[PDB]
C-alpha cells in the first residue's frame, strides 16, 4: 500500500528514539535556527507596562536520528509528532502570560527533511514586559523588547 510504507518509515524513525536527549548530546552543540513572523502587533497597555504580540515562531535544527530514505523528500507530518521527539524548550525571558493557541488543534506544524533538518513552527500570543520612561509623556517613545532563549540548555 502507498501509506503503509510511510507508516513503516515513521515506526523505524521512532524505534530506539529517546525524546529526553537532545541531538548530539555530549558530542556536539545543537544550532537552532529561528525566526519570527509577527501577524499582528497587539495593543500596548501603559497601565501594566505591557504589550501583546501574535507570532508564528519558527525553529529549525538538525537531528541525525531522524534521517530517512523514502519516496518523498520532506514529510509534512502531523503536529501530534511534535510530542514524540525532542524539541527546543524555548521560553520568553520577559513574557508574562503567553498563550499557545490550540483551536481547533494545537497550532503547530512539523516537517522532517530527508537529511534530518527538522522545521517546527508554532502560533503564539506573547504578552511581555515593556518598561517605560514616562518623563516625556505623551511625547515619549519606547523600545519594547521581545527576548527568547532556551530554559534548560546552556551555551
Amino acid at each position: 500500500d502507498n501509506t503503509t510504507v510511510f507508516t513503516r518509515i515513521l515506526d523505524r524513525l521512532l524505534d530506539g528514539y529517546d525524546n529526553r536527549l537532545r541531538p548530539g548530546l555530549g558530542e556536539r552543540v545543537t544550532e537552532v535556527k529561528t525566526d519570527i513572523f509577527v501577524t499582528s502587533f497587539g495593543p500596548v497597555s501603559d497601565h501594566d507596562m505591557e504589550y501583546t504580540i501574535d507570532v508564528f515562531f519558527r525553529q529549525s535544527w538538525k537531528d541525525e536520528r531522524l534521517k530517512f530514505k523514502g519516496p518523498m523528500t520532506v514529510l509534512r507530518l502531523n503536529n501530534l509528532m511534535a510530542s514524540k521527539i525532542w524539541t527546543p524548550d524555548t521560553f520568553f525571558h520577559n513574557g508574562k502570560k503567553s498563550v499557545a493557541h490550540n483551536m481547533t488543534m494545537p497550532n503547530k506544524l512539523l516537517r522532517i527533511t530527508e537529511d534530518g533538518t527538522l522545521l517546527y513552527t508554532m502560533r503564539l500570543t506573547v504578552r511581555a514586559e515593556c518598561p517605560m520612561h514616562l518623563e516625556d509623556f505623551p511625547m515619549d517613545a519606547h523600545a519594547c523588547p521581545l527576548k527568547f532563549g532556551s530554559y534548560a540548555y546552556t551555551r
Epitope: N94, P131, H133, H142, A143, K147
Partner: nanobody, 108 residues
Framework: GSLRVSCAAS????????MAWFRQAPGKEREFLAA???????YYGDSVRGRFTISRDYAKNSVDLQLDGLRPEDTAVYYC?????????????????WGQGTQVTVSS
C-alpha cells in the same frame, strides 16, 4: 595585559536603563563595545567579542568593563554611556548620558 574600568552614576538611578561602553580612537568614529540591560543581559561588539566582559552593579549603580588580551591598536579614549535604546542599543545617538572619557594606551 589586563585592565578594569568602572563607571559610576550619580544624580539619577539607571537600574531601568541600558548601560554601554564606546571607543574613540584618534581619527575614527565612535565604536560600540558592550552593553548591559536591566535583565542582566549582555551584548558585545564583534571586534571585541570574547575578550571584554561587561558587568553591572545595581546596588551602587555602576557598570564595569574588564579588558583582557589587549593589542596595541586598541589604544583609544573609552566613553561610558547610559540610556534607553531607541533606534539603537548599538548607535551612540540613542544615549543621552555620556562620561568625560578615560584614555587607554598600550605600549609594545
Amino acid at each position: 595585559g589586563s585592565l578594569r574600568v568602572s563607571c559610576a552614576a550619580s544624580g539619577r538611578t539607571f537600574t531601568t536603563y541600558i548601560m554601554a561602553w564606546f571607543r574613540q580612537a584618534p581619527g575614527k568614529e565612535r565604536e560600540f563595545l558592550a552593553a548591559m540591560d536591566q535583565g542582566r543581559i549582555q551584548y558585545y561588539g564583534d571586534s571585541v567579542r570574547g575578550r571584554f566582559t561587561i558587568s553591572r552593579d545595581y546596588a551602587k549603580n555602576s557598570v564595569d568593563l574588564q579588558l583582557d588580551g589587549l593589542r596595541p591598536e586598541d589604544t583609544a579614549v573609552y566613553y561610558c554611556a547610559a540610556g534607553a535604546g531607541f533606534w539603537g542599543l548599538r548607535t551612540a545617538s540613542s544615549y543621552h548620558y555620556w562620561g568625560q572619557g578615560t584614555q587607554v594606551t598600550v605600549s609594545s
